[PDB]
Amino acid sequence: FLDGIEKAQEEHEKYHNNWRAMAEDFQIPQVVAKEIVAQCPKCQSPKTWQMDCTHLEGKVIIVAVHVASGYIEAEVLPAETGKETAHFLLKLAARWPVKHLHTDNGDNFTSSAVQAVCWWAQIEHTFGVVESMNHQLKTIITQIRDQAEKIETAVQMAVLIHNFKRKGGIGGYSAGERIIDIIASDLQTTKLQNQISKIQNFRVYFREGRDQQWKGPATLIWKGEGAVVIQDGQDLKVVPRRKCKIIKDYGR
Amino acid sequence: GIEKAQEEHEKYHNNWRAMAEDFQIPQVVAKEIVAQCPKCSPKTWQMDCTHLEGKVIIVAVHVASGYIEAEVLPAETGKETAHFLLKLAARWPVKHLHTDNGDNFTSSAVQAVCWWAQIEHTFGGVVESMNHQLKTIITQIRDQAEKIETAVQMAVLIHNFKRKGGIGGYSAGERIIDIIASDLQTTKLQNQI
Amino acid sequence: SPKTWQMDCTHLEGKVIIVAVHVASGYIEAEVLPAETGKETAHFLLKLAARWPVKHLHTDNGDNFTSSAVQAVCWWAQIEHTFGVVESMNHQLKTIITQIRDQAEKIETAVQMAVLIHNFKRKGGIGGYSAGERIIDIIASDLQTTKLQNQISKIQNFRVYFREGRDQQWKGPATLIWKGEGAVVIQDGQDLKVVPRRKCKIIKDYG
Amino acid sequence: GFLDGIEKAQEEHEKYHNNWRAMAEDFQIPQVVAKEIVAQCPKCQVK
Ligand SMILES: [Zn+2]
Ligand SMILES: [Zn+2]
Ligand SMILES: [Zn+2]
Secondary structure (H helix, E strand, O other): OHHHHHHHHHHHHHHOOOHHHHHHHOOOOHHHHHHHHHOOOOOOOOOEEEEEEEEEOOEEEEEEEEOOOOEEEEEEEOOOOHHHHHHHHHHHHHHOOOOEEEEOOOOOOOOHHHHHHHHHHOOEEEEOOHHHHHHHHHHHHHHOHHHOOOHHHHHHHHHHHHHHOOOEOOOOEOHHHHHHHHHHHHHHHHHHHHHHHHHOOEEEEEEOOOOOOEEEEEEEEEEOOOEEEEEEOOEEEEEEHHHEEEEEOOOO | OHHHHHHHHHHHOOOHHHHHHHHOOOHHHHHHHHHOOOOOOOOEEEEEEEEEOOEEEEEEEEOOOOEEEEEEEOOOOOHHHHHHHHHHHHHOOOOEEEEOOOOOOOOHHHHHHHHHHOOEEEEOOOHHHHHHHHHHHHHHOHHHOOOHHHHHHHHHHHHHHOOOEOOOOEOHHHHHHHHHHHHHHHHHHHHHO | OOOEEEEEEEEEOOEEEEEEEEOOOOEEEEEEEOOOOHHHHHHHHHHHHHHOOOOEEEEOOOOOOOOHHHHHHHHHHOOEEEEOOHHHHHHHHHHHHHHOHHHOOOHHHHHHHHHHHHHHOOOEOOOOEOHHHHHHHHHHHHHHHHHHHHHHHHHOOOEEEEOOOOOOOOOOOEEEEEEOOOEEEEEOOOOEEEEEHHHEEEEOOOO | OOHHHHHHHHHHHHHHOOOHHHHHHHHOOOHHHHHHHHHOOOOOOOO
16 A cells, blocks of 8 residues: 555656556545645646637527537527527526536627526626537538428437537547546546545544554544554655554644 | 448438448448538547647547647747657557648648658647646646656646546547557458458 | 566668667667767657657667766656667668668658668568557557556545445445446445445445 | 624623633523634633
């Protein structure tokens, strides 16, 4: 255990590895690896969307794009007012976790209805990827145009072909697999951070070898069945449970 | 399988490598299927040159795996770019080269090396992210070496063998080895059967 | 061993060439140095370890191979250096250089063209493969072995919530063993069992 | 409800620096929030 922790500290001192790789390679828990990364001075977005409006055959197509993956949601609006833009934004925020929105300085994007929807759903709106995605979507729409009768059907069929049929990039994935992988990784990080804060509200008094006096208050990092990892003096060390006393700490 | 590939391409208009992978068809049939439609790679490398501390870093990236190869140049001529391309072709199998509309990539020595090593040259969002990741690793381990050339080569080692990220969880060197080995066995099976 | 390399330095046309060879495949990397100092040798070893997985190095008792620069690069990249194939590859490389000597101006371009010829245009041996095909096959097989042992544990870190016969509550988190097309093998309290696919929910369960 | 008791106990501790059992018995709030009100004060210490 302690051999793995010292090997992980030496390896991070050379190459600055990440915590998932260190936890998988050196066989230590994930909270200890996250602490090793958090003690480094040289080591210290999944929810941002961009919106735009475009025209096709006298109809208004509104396109939202997820930036970190290239994922697309599109619609056909009856007009270009602010009420229909606010309804499209409310539907997008109901289906996906949206926290940061990037638009241009259009009229319908600068409106009281969009402002009220962003207030209720707690979105940060900023005025200034979507143009490249609009061009790629319109090439698909002219490619599969004769398989449909109306324009709304052709728009949704092109959204399906873009999201689940075109593969590329590094590993050769579509956009739907990339957005699900990105959001799942963020969910793992937030759950581990909750566990880290709940564990680190404690404090440890430990009794060193060949001494009968208790040492200073060391912060708890990991508590096992027979081992305890503590931080003391900018040092991590492993003390067994028979020489430890864990007490609550109120040091806010 | 040919009927399934024809119905799939009639609906969604997929490319030939997607049908050949997902339906297990030899590639000549899929190429002719895509070629018959009216409405319509493990050796593709992309190159770039950038600036850092008054030096010129030339960076070539294998696109199917994110495998990096960087050098610090003493000049931005055509001869040194051709020599870097010649060493890259002498180390790995290079068959498709992508670059931008630059001044050094359109020269007599670059065209002579591409003609001699049989590389298809084409001129036009992966190389920018690779340049950003290389600069961030260089600014991470800058104070471990004195000269900038050692810092570039140490960042190349850290990028190729010490960053295991992505959807699968693999480093870029193991990915390029698996990709070329799988393509070799696939072309061997299509030549045998 | 699939990660052993051997190094040497030679002279040709008044220059100094350095040659590193992967032993189990006969794979050649070679460059032209301006000098025989330890700094340029250590720079070549750093570039070689940055491009290919290098773990064990064999050299002769030279003057540049025994230096603090080479010791520093070997310590930082975690290579094991020992002092005592390369001469046979040197002889073959000189013969190829003399074969295509009238196609390049400098000797550096001649060394690089001979390296491309030796690595991808000289098929021989038993099976009939070149050097690049052999090195790619060998390192891929070694990767497959070690990653197999890690990947089985990765697939057993998932959690399954299943349903038995005529009880309408979802039972607790068994461990996944294999997920088929119409059946799932789970281990529940040291009991292996086979459940249909429509009666299972497979989570990773962060919490 | 005891949330108004939480606000009143914060004002009362800002004046008089009560202990946590006194605030828990007087304002009828649970013991965890009372120990937290003591813990966030820089001058006091829960004991
Ligand atoms: Zn660090
Ligand atoms: Zn087609
Ligand atoms: Zn107080």
